[PDB]
């Protein structure tokens, strides 16, 4: 019913292989997944799917495969990419030539903790005040108002977002650089859906199930899935509290 595609065609950190497993796994439940290698990275092996998920690209993209993703979203096709800390420079892509054209930006920059919590390695964010958009939801040394769920953000970079996009998560008050956009969306009616995740590691098979983390997962291929019923807040929309 509904096909997802996770790539291995640029060299992806995280696939079914490798990063992705219980992913993929929880996504059988209510989709139907699959992969999609170096070979058959074309418009037709695209055309029959719904979702694609770029899980952490290592490798360029080249001119041709940019306007193939283009092509893929005008014909009503949903794109899901995750980048890493350290941003395009640090993994060796070129996506934000794509992601720019939609209003979108992965910065070259690392989120850490700003507090203390015991069990977390500094890169690995707590964010309890980091929802942008409510659509996503419906002393010791160092220890709608966007709460209401709490995920960890893991070994991720901050995203630049402008109009035509929308961002709808957050780095929150606690982290390095506070209340920046950490995942952002791109819509339009009767058209495809794009959105961008700084951070693989939120959806591995550690951190899936913490926190709220796959709540937050939950919410994105409902988002990214054919004839969506998500809509985003407009208030929030228009005027994100980041």
Request: with cysteine.
């Amino acid at each position: 019913e509904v096909r997802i595609l996770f790539s291995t065609a640029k060299g992806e950190s995280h696939t079914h292989k490798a990063g992705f497993k219980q992913l993929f796994r929880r996504l059988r439940s209510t989709y139907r997944p699959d992969k999609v290698d170096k070979d058959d990275f074309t418009l037709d092996t695209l055309r029959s799917a719904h979702i694609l998920v770029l899980g952490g690209p290592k490798e360029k993209f080249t001119a041709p495969e940019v306007d193939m993703l283009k092509k893929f979203v005008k014909n009503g096709g949903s794109i899901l990419i995750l980048m890493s800390e350290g941003g395009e420079e640090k993994a060796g892509t070129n996506i934000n030539y794509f992601l720019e054209q939609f209003g979108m930006s992965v910065n070259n920059d690392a989120v850490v903790r700003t507090t203390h919590y015991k069990y977390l390695h500094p890169k690995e964010v707590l964010i309890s005040d980091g929802i942008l958009n409510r659509a996503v939801i419906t002393d010791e040394f160092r220890v709608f108002d966007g709460t209401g769920l709490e995920y960890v953000f893991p070994f991720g970079a901050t995203l630049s977002v402008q109009k035509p996009a929308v961002p709808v998560l957050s780095s929150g008050k606690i982290a390095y650089p506070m209340n920046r956009p950490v995942g952002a969306v791109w819509a339009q009616p009767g058209y495809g859906r794009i959105a961008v995740l700084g951070s693989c590691a939120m959806f591995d098979d550690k951190w899936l199930d913490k926190e709220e983390n796959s709540k937050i997962m939950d919410f994105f291929f409902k988002f990214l899935e054919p004839h969506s019923k998500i809509q985003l807040n407009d208030i929030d929309a228009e005027e994100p509290d980041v």
